Design a protein around this ligand. Structure first.
Ligand code: CA
Length: 266
């Protein structure tokens, strides 16, 4: 099958807390990495998005690949995670309303999240984080989170949709160990603080998105996500760091290896 690919800073628009720089000792194999959440402010928290400049057409196949490197922080102090979000709205709306990583964000937004935080506002826990059976039971110092597709309702409220992870023995099923203390660049164990690909592979014939990350696979249909295949969508890569957290929540990608690949056929 012949495909076309767009990538890199020329094809994404930054919104909010996004910077670019080298990390020579920690990522000597890499060029310019793109960092979210570096504007640290425990009074407000922070957030950022990268918005793809072209529309997503859910009547045709696509594969989206995003290299991510997670903060090496426990789930009560680090960043909220990564939200790979499809929406009729834009990055400006996201800065205004929020995304898919918390309790509520942009109305009708949907997509895949890597949730790296146990979010608790004075004893009120984000609903999906409180799901000890499917999602999350290790809280505090653990660098433990979870993956899942999600859909924001007409009211913005985030709900879990699609399938639980399809190829795992982990308990909870959706678990992701998103970082550890390894600094070795060659070691072949999975290390979520190093760069690892998120792959979103959409099959138009079956209306199904497959998400692969950390060797785990999730699936959701356009019907699960509320996606109208007759309408073109925007795609955003999002991250955020909650207020009242007192160490860095820096989350990084390599934008020149963020690829949006589609058939050359119409
Ligand atoms: Ca969370």
């Amino acid at each position: 099958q012949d495909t076309v690919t767009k990538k890199g800073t020329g094809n994404f628009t930054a919104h909010g807390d996004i910077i670019h720089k080298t990390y020579k000792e920690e990522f000597p194999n890499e060029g310019t990495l793109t960092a979210f959440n570096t504007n640290f402010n425990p009074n407000t928290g922070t957030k950022g998005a990268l918005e793809y400049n072209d529309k997503i057409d859910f009547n045709k196949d696509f594969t989206i690949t995003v290299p991510v490197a997670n903060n090496n922080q426990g789930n009560t102090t680090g960043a909220d995670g990564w939200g790979f979000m499809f929406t009729q709205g834009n990055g400006q709306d996201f800065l205004n309303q929020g995304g898919i990583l918390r309790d509520k964000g942009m109305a009708n937004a949907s997509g895949f999240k890597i949730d790296t935080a146990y979010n608790n506002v004075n004893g009120k826990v984000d609903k999906l984080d409180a799901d000890k059976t499917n999602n999350l039971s290790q809280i505090g110092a653990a660098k433990v989170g979870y993956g899942t597709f999600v859909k924001n309702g007409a009211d913005g409220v985030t709900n879990q949709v699609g399938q639980n992870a399809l190829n795992t023995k982990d308990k909870p099923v959706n678990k992701i160990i998103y970082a550890d203390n390894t600094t070795n660049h060659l070691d072949g164990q999975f290390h979520g603080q190093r760069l690892n690909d998120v792959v979103l592979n959409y099959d138009a014939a079956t209306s199904t998105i497959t998400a692969t990350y950390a060797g785990k696979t999730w699936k959701a249909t356009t019907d699960d996500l509320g996606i109208d295949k007759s309408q073109k969508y925007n795609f955003l890569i999002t991250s955020s760091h909650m207020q009242n957290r007192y160490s860095n929540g820096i989350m990084r990608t390599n934008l020149e290896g963020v690829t949006i690949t589609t058939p050359q056929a119409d």
